[PDB]
Design a binder for these strands. Sequence first.
RNA 1: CUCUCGGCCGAAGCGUUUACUUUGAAAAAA
RNA 2: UGGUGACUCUAGAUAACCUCGGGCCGAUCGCACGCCGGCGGCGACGACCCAUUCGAACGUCUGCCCUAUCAACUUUCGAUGGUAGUCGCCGUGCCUACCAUGGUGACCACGGGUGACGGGGAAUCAGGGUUCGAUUCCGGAGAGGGAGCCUGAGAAACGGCUACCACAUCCAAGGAAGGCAGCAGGCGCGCAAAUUACCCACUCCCGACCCGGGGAGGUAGUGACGAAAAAUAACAAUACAGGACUCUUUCGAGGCCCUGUAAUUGGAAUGAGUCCACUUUAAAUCCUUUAACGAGGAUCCAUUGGAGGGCAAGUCUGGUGCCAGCAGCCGCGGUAAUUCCAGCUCCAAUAGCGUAUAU
RNA 3: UACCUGGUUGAUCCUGCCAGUAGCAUAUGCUUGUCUCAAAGAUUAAGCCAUGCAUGUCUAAGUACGCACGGCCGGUACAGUGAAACUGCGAAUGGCUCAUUAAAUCAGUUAUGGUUCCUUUGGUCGCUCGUACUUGGAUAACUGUGGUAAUUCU
Lengths: 180, 124, 262
Amino acid sequence: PVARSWVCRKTYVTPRRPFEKSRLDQELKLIGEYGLRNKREVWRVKFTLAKIRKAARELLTLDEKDPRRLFEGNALLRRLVRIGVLDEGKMKLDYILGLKIEDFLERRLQTQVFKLGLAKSIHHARVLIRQRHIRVRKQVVNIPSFIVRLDSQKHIDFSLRSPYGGGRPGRVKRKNAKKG
Amino acid sequence: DTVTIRTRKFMTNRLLQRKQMVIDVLHPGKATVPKTEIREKLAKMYKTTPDVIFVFGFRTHFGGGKTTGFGMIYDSLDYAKKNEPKHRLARHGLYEKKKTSRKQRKERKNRMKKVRGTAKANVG
Amino acid sequence: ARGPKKHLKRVAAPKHWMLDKLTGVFAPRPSTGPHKLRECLPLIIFLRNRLKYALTGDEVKKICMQRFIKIDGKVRTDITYPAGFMDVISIDKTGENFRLIYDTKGRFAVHRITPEEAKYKLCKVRKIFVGTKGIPHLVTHDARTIRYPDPLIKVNDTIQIDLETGKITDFIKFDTGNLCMVTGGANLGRIGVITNRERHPGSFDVVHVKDANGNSFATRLSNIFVIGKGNKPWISLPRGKGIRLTIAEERDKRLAAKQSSG
RNA sequence: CUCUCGGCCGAAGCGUUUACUUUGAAAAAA
RNA sequence: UGGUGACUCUAGAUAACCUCGGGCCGAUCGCACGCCGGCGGCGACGACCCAUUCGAACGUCUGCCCUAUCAACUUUCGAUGGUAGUCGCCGUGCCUACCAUGGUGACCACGGGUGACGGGGAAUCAGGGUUCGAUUCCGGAGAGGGAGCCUGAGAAACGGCUACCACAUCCAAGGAAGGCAGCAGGCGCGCAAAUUACCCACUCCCGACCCGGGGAGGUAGUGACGAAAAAUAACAAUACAGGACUCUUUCGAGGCCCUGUAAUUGGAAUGAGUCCACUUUAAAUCCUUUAACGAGGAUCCAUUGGAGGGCAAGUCUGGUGCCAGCAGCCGCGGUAAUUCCAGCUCCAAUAGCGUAUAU
RNA sequence: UACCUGGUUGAUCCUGCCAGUAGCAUAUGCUUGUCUCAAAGAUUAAGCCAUGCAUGUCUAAGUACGCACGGCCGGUACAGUGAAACUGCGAAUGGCUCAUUAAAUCAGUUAUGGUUCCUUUGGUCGCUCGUACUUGGAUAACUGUGGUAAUUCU
């Protein structure tokens, strides 16, 4: 017996057909457009959307006045709205089935850092986040896959300690200024 | 002073003759604040000496803004010696533990098990 | 196994203790006592997990061995002493009295009572029997034996015990129309008026209960604890008055409370 | 009807039975 | 007297018994102190008995894998039931003595096998299913194999005892002492699995106990079982390329866009790492947090498989010549081999990828 | 994601299997920078084990004439701390493993009106019509004498 927990879970699913030209092209387009490291990030977002769709489908088989359908559909729609993937106007479970993987990919911290003008490109955005230059509200966030909530979107700033956002020039600039 | 001390949670534990609280330490450009100066800041904050203050469990949040720990302020140093864990008293210099190891004590005990009477004290 | 067990695994502990899973391998095995293992709250869980007066089991022991904790008017130094339903916990040093009373979720609430209320407790009589040359005896859910009870007191009634002297001062019969709490099952912690008792000879009687908001449920007779005559309780009730809101109403109440701040 | 009927309340009946279906209890935690 | 659906219940009364291996009815310990020889407060400990708690034990109903190359099985070596008893904590063929001749079975008894502990559960899965579950929770069983006990409330206990069987330790040869399927560790076995580490600080347990003890447990070490997050560059200029209703062709309306061999040019930005002080923690480590140094082949260098099809990706170059080899399958190799051995290039996943096997 | 593809023929449509495909679990190979969780001698051998440790325990409150420390030199028995030992309690829990085991174990469901129950908690405990201002003998520890090669022997 140990005081440890072994609840662990795989966050993606490998495609059934390994070498399929259309799927390879779609995934590479997503990777390049959103500056992703590998195919596993695409597969992870795909798995997230797949689980959400499965839950929405299972709710859509219940009676429209089912207490569980009402409660859990309201919760799921609230969660999707909270991260900006769903619009507040479309608060029906049928609109969940109309969601795309790109809808979730827009809400990554990397995409928002690029799209708010803090970075010149999506790859610059990723290296900025990985180098502790970005904060959401007052928390220095370091994870590119950080899914920005709707009310956290206006609090993505440039970190009070980063050379770009409050001073203390970096290693290179300080060394060069010391040199001459 | 650029280092700030705040106490979110707080209760007067009259059962253990102390006050117990959660301590936030704001230290934007400094290392995690040493326990001693947190103790003197708490002493000023609560109008008491820093010898009846025992702080522990300070974790600095990712990014470096602040550190959260726990703190006790005892009514007297005698209550502090009575109720505090021995290691937290040793951190203040008010306690010294046994210098033997578990191995030495266990083997000495099993050796004493082999002798009967006053000869047990004449072992090791 | 040979002989009795002395340990309780943390995950086999009663879920209403609200113990987490990463603190340790073991849960505090309640000592034998007035209440059953699964229907009790040990003193350590109350003084450490609920009241936060202690951080560890060592501090719970330090509090208990100063004789600051009274359970039902008597000082208890056993930190795993099983405190159960209706039991009164008095801490005179901090001047606070609690009565162990179930929540609508089936958990023992931290329910503070006045020092005047802390003088008595309700007890459901478990059995009535004649012994010792015609002396009537009464046994409660608290497991206290009372000699010479009122001749009208029967099984499943509720008596009021003055903790200082431990003798019956009043009693409610088990009648339709009396307020009652549920002390076990799916409806544990719910308070309502007894509507009807369907009797099943040789099996378990079912008691139907109606909430103060009009919700009707049913339990086994062994899970019914008469609280007050009519619809007026003889004890203080927690903030939730035994009315179990559905999850939708809980969500709505939480959202309304959150939106009222800021 | 209810072999207790009393000037709105209860001794008012698995009323051959079962399967089925819909309930309600009770049913460890993880 | 009360109670149950239901007593041969509870309570009462009578006549007696009342176990030498004889049962309860206190020859006990502390603290505080008292009160016109007496009366006492607060406890600790102990003893019946009755409840209660924690259980244990024994029954009820339903549910278990494969096998008929297992069709009949059991029958006083108690088999099924009855009566009386014995024993047992108690119900009972539990055992005994008489009596009856029963009881189970194709609705699969009985026998056999199981690389069979059962369950909660796990993998996979459109719906249905299939396989797995030694493994941290619950229940059972065992402590080398059997058997038998002592003590005790509780054990047929094995970090208790007694004996035999197997193995085995010391011996002065007379004797004596054994039980890691506890924690480490060793040998052996194998395709196959970690430290003879630190601590009772946490969770709890035990004790006469606030204080002692705990290889339970926690903490570190080994760890690519597996799961999560996530670096190996980003940007700008320069030369070049591409589009942008560019005029129905040639840098006179081609830089408010975009790409790359660029060993081109620049500054910025970083953590991998090293190191300091905190923090962490029994004490440490780790993470977090400061600070110092730390990137231009940023040589601080990403690999594992493949490139005929299935199936993403070269009938490019050299070698070999039905050889060596490749190839899960079809096939390739006999002098232009898109398939072997290599170089270059490419592409699949990526701190991971290939292979075998089970599913 | 309720999915298929190659292979029998000169060619075709089938049956049909082989091979491919994805997960999962053990092993292994090559490779491996950061960080958080985290399995880990089950499978074969419930095979064998060197060594060490894993179960002990004292309160004001059972027994202290161990000077082992320690005082207030006394109708002052016992100041106090306290090894040892006697007494009490625990050692039947925990941990390990899966050999046995096929209505057996186990699961849900009931029953004990057919039983036992240390401890905890509450009750009962002048309810008995018949040296007490405290009874008896031992034995440990301790002192002293020993035996055996050898033991937690005595």
